[PDB]
Amino acid sequence: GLLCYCRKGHCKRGGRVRGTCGIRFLYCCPRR
């Protein structure tokens, strides 16, 4: 939720992965 984004392979403009967005997808949150 929040302002998190699901990106395939690797999150764009963000190195704060929150967890896996399923298979071959990364879910990152710009929190900390």
Q: Domain boundaries in the chain? A: 1-32
Closest C-alpha among 20, 18, 13 to residue 28: 18
**Is 11:2 a contact under the CB 8 Å cutoff?**
no
User: How many Å apart are CA 7 and CA 28, to the nearest integer?
Assistant: 8
Residues 6 or more apart whose Cβ sits within 8 Å of residue 1: none
Give, in order, the Cα–Cα distances in Å from 26 to each of 13, 18: 13, 8
> What is the residue type of 20?
T
3-class secondary structure per residue, 10-31: CCCCCCCEEEECCCCEEEECCC
Q: State the alpha helices, DSSP H only, in the chain.
A: none
Count of CB atoms situated within 10 Å of the CB of 18: 17
> What is the residue type of 3?
L
Sheet holding 17-20, edge to edge: 5-8, 25-28, 17-20
